[PDB]
Design a protein around this nucleic acid. Structure first.
Lengths: 241, 123, 131, 33
RNA sequence: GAAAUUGUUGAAAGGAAGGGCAUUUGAUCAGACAUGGUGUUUUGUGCCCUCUGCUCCUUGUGGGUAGGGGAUCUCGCAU
RNA sequence: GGAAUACUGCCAGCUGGGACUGAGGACUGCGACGUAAGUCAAGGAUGCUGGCAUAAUGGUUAUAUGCCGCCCGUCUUGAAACACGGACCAAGGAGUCUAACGUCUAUGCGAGUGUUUGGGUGUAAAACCCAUACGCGUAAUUGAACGUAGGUUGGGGCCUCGCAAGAGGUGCACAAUCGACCGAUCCUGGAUGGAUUUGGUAAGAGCAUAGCUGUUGGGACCCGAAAG
RNA sequence: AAGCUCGUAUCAGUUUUAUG
């Protein structure tokens, strides 16, 4: 007689087939969703690039018109500043150390984006000797996010290498791509804090071309390395990155 | 197999193991607070620590790529039939030459590598 | 957090092994509570008297809600009308077992309860007093 | 298992941003005002 | 029959020696009775073909063991 | 008047040279090329070539070379220092045992628990059983069921509603509030009615053995002093 | 070290506004 298959084996095979019949359809659904998400990300990136180009063109045109009109154009105050730890853990005074810890500056050559606010200005003023900060540009932010951008999956540090990773965590607020994260970082939107906290503190190497000044522990306005280096912060970050 | 990277080939030696004959070469941690070795000052003998840990994928593997396995008789030797590539039969020092030839014959028959063949034997 | 049982009993280890799988593959918090309680020490697992179960069985709809105890069930002569119900516990004393069986109820092990109620439907876990 | 670095290995870059292809179509960087 | 210690031979090196990182030179020790694997072509065999038997359980998709006939034969072995 | 150039910044622009790294180990995924087949630099080195059994290489030690390294342990002290001991070697050498009182962990039983002071038995200090007493707990401010031997509010958990968020129902231990008997404040006059807090029942949770561990007395981690 | 609840609104050698 024909040896009948085990009843337990038959049940296992039936369950496996039933699960596969759904997994196969879920695979196609995921592929279609990924295609739609890619199209949406492409259109969003195009819109963001157009917005940036229009903003820069409008700023330049306004400056030129103000110059021609014989008046003064007051550029909008920068609302985003990046901060990098310049001094080591040793001998840091207590209150500055607590401020740096609250700023997630737990190690040298590390930095995070800080929103420019009335309250944060005093905090920055309190840690000037130990941190160098300035106004980052779009290119610097994009390079940082692309090269050393790491996502925090609820407890940990995860490299940002796929839009799906960002969507699974930051998709709650409509951010579904690295470009969306960069846009929400450069522009201080309502969900700026969530995006800033999601990104792990950047681990930056020492500058490729050195710090330039013979002594780092001085104000940037007097040939030092810390303080307000608004325009040169981008160059410093790029050299360190 | 993965490269056998030996983090520390030099045998660790106890401090002053050569200055005084009453100090055995076996490593022993210095307990005095003033001891320079305990503070690992520059130029002192290296202190064993967790850093020198060998990787699992190559731990206990001899340079020939076969793990050592003490064999007492033919019954023990036959256990390495399914692990000839990963394990090698090592004859114990107490095995008389009478049984050594028999063990070597079985190892050759099964193709089990012998770490110390011909011991106590003459041709 | 206690993650392994200090008891050397192999049967308790098997129960822990089963309950870990049940909790990890079911997601029902009922299995998690029992698994966590299984690690409690003897001092942390006071016995639950049959009188306590009887008085807790006055809860609405408790007739069809099998009671569960992670510790040991002890008899109680202070009562004589133990409700007919099923009680699941690691160990049942001779007096408590006789009282439960004599009242038309049943006594089962933790594995039997888990098989009967993998999701813990209608279950009721009782914990002995510590004061 | 290994972090591919953007700004190089264009293959991974396209995955992160599909708009990179359109960017490279005109290079998107030498636009004349 | 080991050290502390002592005398000889040899090597080395010379108001000191001792240890650590890396290496040259000198001396010296290990360094496969590994001698394979695959498909093809002759020939002799068996557990191989065929006929005839015996024997153990249980009963089973078995095991063990004999007497007559050949190289349909690579099913394995040795050439 | 117009080119540029000088300088800052951008290129998801192009193109080389140099150094280290090859980690994972049959396919599961994100992407690109292409109408498709298929391919790819797309979640970690692939292919070819060159030397080898009197091998190739690797290993032990003496010296040497570029650099570094105050003599070991103890105690003073805030420090470095002084000082206490150290000629060398083989053996010997020090928180060990006991009685009581505890926490934690494990085992057995469980409102019962403890065979081994003994008796029976015995292959004999071994192994196996328990008649009667005994220690502990099982209940006490006289006595606690009228009720979850308690209403309400939270409360691990369970059930119904629902794809989720959440809503409703039911609730162990535990916590807040207010609760019942029965006695002392403190009135009242040996009671009576009770002033306002009072300590039990509340609902048993305990007994025996094994392990680390703490205190005390015994020599008490070891060596040692004027004496009687 | 161990038990309860809670992963919640619990906090801070941080800053600013209001009560001088």
């Amino acid at each position: 007689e024909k040896i009948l298959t085990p009843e337990s084996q038959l049940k296992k095979s039936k369950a496996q087939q039933k699960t596969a019949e759904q997994v196969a359809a879920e695979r196609a659904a995921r592929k279609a969703a990924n295609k739609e998400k890619r199209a949406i990300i492409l259109e969003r990136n195009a819109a963001y690039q157009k917005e940036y180009e229009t903003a820069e063109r409008n700023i330049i045109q306004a400056k030129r018109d103000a110059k021609a009109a014989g008046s003064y154009y007051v550029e909008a105050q920068h609302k985003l500043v990046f901060v990098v730890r310049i001094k080591g853990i040793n001998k840091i005074p207590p209150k500055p150390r607590k401020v740096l810890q609250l700023l997630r500056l737990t190690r040298i050559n590390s930095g995070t984006f800080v929103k420019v606010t009335k309250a944060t200005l005093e905090l920055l003023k309190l840690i000037e000797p130990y941190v160098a900060y300035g106004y980052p540009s779009y290119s610097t932010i994009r390079q940082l996010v692309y090269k050393r951008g790491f996502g925090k999956i609820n407890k940990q540090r995860v490299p940002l290498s796929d839009n799906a990773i960002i969507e699974a965590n930051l998709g709650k607020y409509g951010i579904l791509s690295i470009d969306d994260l960069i846009h929400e970082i450069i522009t201080v939107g309502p969900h700026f804090k969530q995006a800033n906290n999601f990104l792990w503190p950047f681990k930056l190497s020492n500058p490729s071309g050195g710090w330039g000044v013979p002594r780092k522990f001085k104000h940037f306005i007097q040939g030092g390395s810390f303080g307000n280096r608004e325009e040169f912060i981008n160059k410093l970050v790029k050299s360190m990155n | 197999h993965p490269k056998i990277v030996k983090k520390h080939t030099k045998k660790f030696k106890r401090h002053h193991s050569d200055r005084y004959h009453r100090v055995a070469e076996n490593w022993r941690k210095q307990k005095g607070i003033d001891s320079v070795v305990r503070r690992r000052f520059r130029g002192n003998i290296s202190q064993p620590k967790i850093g020198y840990g060998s990787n699992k994928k190559t731990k206990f593997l001899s340079p020939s790529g076969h793990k050592t396995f003490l064999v007492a008789n033919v019954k023990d030797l036959e256990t390495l039939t399914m692990h000839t590539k990963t394990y090698a039969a090592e004859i114990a020092h107490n095995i008389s030459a009478k049984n050594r030839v028999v063990i070597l014959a079985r190892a050759k028959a099964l193709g089990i590598k012998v770490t110390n063949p011909k011991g106590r034997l003459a041709l | 957090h206690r993650t392994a049982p200090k008891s050397d009993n192999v049967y308790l280890k098997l129960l822990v092994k089963l309950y870990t799988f049940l909790a990890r593959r079911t997601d029902a918090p009922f299995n998690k509570v029992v698994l966590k309680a299984l690690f409690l020490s003897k001092i942390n697992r006071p016995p639950v008297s049959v009188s306590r179960i009887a008085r807790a069985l006055k809860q609405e709809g408790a007739a069809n809600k099998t009671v569960v105890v992670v510790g040991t069930v002890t008899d109680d002569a202070r009562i004589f009308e133990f409700p007919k119900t099923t009680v699941a516990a690691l160990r049942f004393t001779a007096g408590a077992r006789a009282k439960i069986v004599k009242a038309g109820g049943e006594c089962i092990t933790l594995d039997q309860l888990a098989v009967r109620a993998p999701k813990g439907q209608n279950t009721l876990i009782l914990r002995g007093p510590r004061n | 298992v290994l972090k591919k670095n953007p700004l190089k290995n264009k293959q991974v870059l396209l995955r992160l941003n599909p708009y990179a292809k359109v960017f490279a179509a005109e290079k998107l960087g030498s636009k004349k005002a």
